[PDB]
Design a protein around this nucleic acid. Structure first.
Lengths: 109, 64, 164
RNA sequence: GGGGAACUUGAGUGCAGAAGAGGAGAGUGGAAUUCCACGUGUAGCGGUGAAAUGCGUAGAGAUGUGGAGGAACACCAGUGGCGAAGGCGACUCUCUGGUCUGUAACUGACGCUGAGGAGCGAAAGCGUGGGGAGCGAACAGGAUUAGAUACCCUGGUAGUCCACGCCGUAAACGAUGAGUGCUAAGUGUUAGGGGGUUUCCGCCCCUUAGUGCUGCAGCUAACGCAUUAAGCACUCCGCCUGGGGAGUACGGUCGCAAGACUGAAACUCAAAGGAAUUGACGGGGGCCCGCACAAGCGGUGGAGCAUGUGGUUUAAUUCGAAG
RNA sequence: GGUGGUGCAUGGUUGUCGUCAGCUCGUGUCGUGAGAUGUUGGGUUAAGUCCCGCAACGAGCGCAACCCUUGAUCUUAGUUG
């Protein structure tokens, strides 16, 4: 991103299009807004481990207590913090993420 | 589908009921299968208990 | 829990296996490795070692060793009681004894118990003579050990009442 | 362990139901194959990778009616029913076994397993007669092929079929010896039973019994197995101790015989097998490629001659390269 | 000194599968282990070409490209042309 606005932007008019900006569309999606991490975190919040056991496995494998809204078919042996609620209610998944984001918001002092 | 017998809740076929039997017989005379008719297993086994007998009294055709 | 890497690991190897794979041209000889890793103060572990060379497999054994360690009770430089581990067709039992009895164990197993610090074990490899599973026959039994003060806390009972 | 006395859950009995291709018996049909009688009718049908042998102007094949006779019992048919297993599917009757539910009326542990012993046990085969339409080992013929004592081909004997007697073996398989309890579910499906609104139909829930599939813990060497265990426990019976030699020899029983059951050894190899993985192959599949093939052009193999190795030839025919 | 011997002692050097679309590594896991994933699935291409999906994310040797030739034109330079 230093290259496209500050660095050497004038190489080809299509080297950036085929390669560089095609990279920019991928990594801003697939590596997204976790990009400023520089650390191994000690928590994780997910929505459906029964859909997505794959992400939980290495988090379990490094002894990391995580949180998460779970479905009734999920794994309480896996997760330390059980939150049983509607997995697909758009208000409730906004509601439960609002309380937890405001939990750490008040904990900034 | 719907069992024809449980719609009546009916017991013994009373073999002379040929028009009741002819609903369960195909065009040329063969036995209509269970899963198309959607009968019950107790009822389907009474059908061939009944249909075969009326074949031997010429009230149901073998091959027409 | 997970044992931390804030220890003094001693990490002497056991065996090396050259291990093949058959391609269009011919074979491909690589090497296998496994290194028992620990201190002499009750922490034992290992990892696999896979490479295309001899010494880089020795390196990568230490990684999963530091990923997977396990702790053993050292009551009087013995195992505190008698146990028989049964992981995967290699049975290796474990018997405690008095303190003069030394380390009588199998070939790879003798490079485990000295990497515990525990110097008083009688044992006998009942099962197969394969180096990975005999080490799996040890730590699985060593995982199922118990401490004297711990089970009295489990029973809600006196520790000396377990002795008298 | 033994004796004396009680309890009813184990198991059994009564009673009230329900399911059934469970067995044995005498009889009953309906298409279809062939056979034969005949009408009608003409050159072939018959059969294969291709074709022939077989059948045919004496009238086949096709077709119409009629007749004998056997055996098989479509449709229903379904990881559907039932039996302990082998097994049993047209129909009806006579005779007969167990199964499961409902409780509670009864018995008061009466039960489980079971070496030898007993009986059953598909198909083949055996002995005596019955019956033999298809089908069909042996054999024969025509092809196929270098060979065809085979696959194909048209026939074709025993057989299968029945009553009665015997052999008593099979991948007689869930490759899982029988019983008792216990251990997440979800799911159909066969027979019930209980309820919840409902006469209903129905939906829902509880519940016994086999019946299948996907699944947790645990078991497993891996595949897999998972309330129908290969989980954890226990009672009883059989079997194994490397592979071949070998289920052979010998000895004995049994049988009408064929051979079954019990069952070795000298010898000899350092291994034979178990699942799994990467590969390579397949007269296994799916995608896909190159003048590979097809669609074309022009040559090589004939002719002389140049040239290159063969062999052979010589004093040596320098040595190397060999799809 | 050997054109003496052995290319189954060898360096080096080239053919060959074929200019075929492939061969692996690092980390992560997966499986007691061998290995497996990445490279497979979907859509394309001359191509592991490239996109999407994907318990894998990446990188390396390859493919192609930058190299020449020929195919157009301009600048500069016109003799022995």
């Amino acid at each position: 991103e230093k290259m496209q606005e500050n660095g050497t932007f004038d190489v080809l008019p299509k080297k950036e299009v085929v390669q560089l900006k095609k990279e920019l569309e991928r990594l801003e999606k697939f590596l997204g807004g976790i990009k400023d991490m520089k650390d191994l975190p000690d928590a994780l919040f997910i929505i459906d481990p029964r859909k997505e056991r794959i992400a939980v496995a290495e988090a379990r494998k490094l002894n990391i207590p995580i949180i998460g809204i779970v479905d009734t078919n999920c794994d309480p042996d896996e997760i330390d913090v059980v939150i049983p609620a509607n997995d697909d209610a758009i208000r409730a998944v906004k509601l439960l993420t609002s309380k937890m984001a405001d939990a750490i918001l008040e904990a900034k002092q | 589908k719907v069992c024809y017998f449980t719609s009546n809740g009916i017991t013994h076929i009373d073999y002379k009921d040929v028009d009741l039997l002819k609903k369960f017989v195909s065009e040329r005379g063969k036995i209509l299968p269970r899963r198309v008719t959607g009968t019950n297993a107790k009822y389907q086994r009474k059908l061939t208990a009944a249909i075969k007998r009326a074949r031997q009294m010429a009230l149901l055709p073998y091959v027409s | 829990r997970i044992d931390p890497s804030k220890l003094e690991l001693e990490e002497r190897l056991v065996t090396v296996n050259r291990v093949a794979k058959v391609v269009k041209g011919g074979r491909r000889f690589r090497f296998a490795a496994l290194v028992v890793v620990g201190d002499k103060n009750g922490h034992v572990g290992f990892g696999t070692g896979k490479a295309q060379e001899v010494p880089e497999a020795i390196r990568k054994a230490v990684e999963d060793a530091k990923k997977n360690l396990i702790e053993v009770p050292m009551v009087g430089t013995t195992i505190p009681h008698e146990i028989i581990g049964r992981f995967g067709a290699g049975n290796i039992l474990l018997k405690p004894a008095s303190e003069g009895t030394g380390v009588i164990a199998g070939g790879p197993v003798r490079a485990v118990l000295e990497l515990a610090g525990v110097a008083d074990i009688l044992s006998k490899s009942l099962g197969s003579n394969t180096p990975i599973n005999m080490i799996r026959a040890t730590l699985q039994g060593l995982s199922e050990l118990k401490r004297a003060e711990d089970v009295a806390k489990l029973r809600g009972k006196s520790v000396e009442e377990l002795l008298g």
